[PDB]
């Protein structure tokens, strides 16, 4: 683990890093939020911002120092603060940002800054390639409504890594966390759909825990079963 400012960076694979930022919430303590950094050829790709614009700027600063390649694009997995909180930092730096069309539509109501481009998805959940230009190893999948109506997920092609965001919780988790915006009826099916979308992924990266095995997906699904 590497510390850079208030952020921590961990290499998960030769070309993949996890970024972690913290937000102190009064009465509840500091909460960690994870994202991904992917090196693809002569460019870098980001998945999710940090909690804030300042923290996100630090991600770009670490990238400059540790990777020294231009950041080509970023993808945010839904319209909540821990995933979209630092959109300004990305846009200030001239980085093209992509999100679920629904996330961009919800963003203003959520107090978030919308991404600059919209992803749309097929009936089977896979992104329509036309809306996801030059994503390299990033394979984006909409598993259906769960944590939120708009949550999307990301696999890293050519690695054992898949990113479930706030949809997937780790196998040690006691609850499904914040269900304030959740679709409790479809949550279980969506978690399982993600598992089926990336059947070979063995390392599951998520928003609020260290990377886990596929057990995180199944354990989440089974916790969600009880919500019905
Ligand atoms: C604060 C907001 O961004 C919230 C969300 O996205 O729903 C953050 C905080 C949280 S709570 C973190 C884990 N909580 C466990 N009780 C989650 C989450 O559950 O995914 N995401
Ligand atoms: Zn959320
Ligand atoms: Zn979260």
Residue numbers in the entry: 43 to 270
Text of the article:
NDM-1 belongs to the B1 subclass of MBLs that requires a dinuclear metal center for full catalytic activity. Zn1 is ligated to three histidine residues, H120, H122, and H189, while Zn2 is coordinated with D124, C208, and H250. To address whether carbapenems undergo pyrroline tautomerization during hydrolysis and whether diverse protonation mechanisms exist for different β-lactams, we conduct a combined investigation on NDM-1-catalyzed hydrolysis of imipenem and meropenem using X-ray crystallography and NMR spectrometry. Our data presented here revealed informative details of the reaction including (i) double-bond tautomerization in the pyrroline ring following the cleavage of the lactam amide bond; (ii) three derivatives presumably representing EI1, EI2, and EP; (iii) absence of the bridging water molecule attributed to steric hindrance from the newly formed carboxylate that is forced to take a distinctive orientation resulting from the trans configuration of the β-lactam ring in carbapenems; and (iv) exclusive stereoselective protonation of the carbanionic intermediates.
Six imipenem-bound and five meropenem-bound structures were determined by molecular replacement and refined at resolutions from 1.80 to 2.32 Å. We first modeled hydrolyzed imipenem or meropenem in the Δ2 isoform in all crystals and found that the ligands could be well fitted in density in some structures with good planarity remaining among C1, C2, C3 and the sulfur atom bonded to the R2 side chain during refinement. We finally modeled Δ2 (EI1) in one imipenem- and three meropenem-bound structures and Δ1 (EI2 or EP) in five imipenem- and two meropenem-bound structures. In four imipenem- and all five meropenem-bound structures determined in this study, the carbapenem intermediates present in either Δ2 (EI1) or Δ1 (EI2) bind the dinuclear metal center in a consensus manner with hydrolyzed penicillins or cephalosporins revealed in NDM-1 strucutures. The newly formed C6-carboxylate contacts Zn1, while the lactam nitrogen (N4) and C3-carboxylate interact with Zn2. The sulfur-bonded pyrrolidine ring in meropenem was also well defined in density, but the hydrophilic formimidamide group in imipenem was rather mobile, as indicated by higher B-factors or even the absence of visible density. The crystallographic entrapment of both Δ2 and Δ1 isomers sufficiently demonstrates that hydrolysis proceeds via an open-ring derivative with a negative charge delocalized over a conjugated π-system covering C2 and N4, which is dynamically stabilized at the active site of NDM-1. A tentative equilibrium between the two intermediates, EI1 and EI2, is thus established before protonation occurs. Owing to the lack of the bridging water that may serve as an ideal proton donor, protonation at the lactam nitrogen (N4) seems to be impossible.
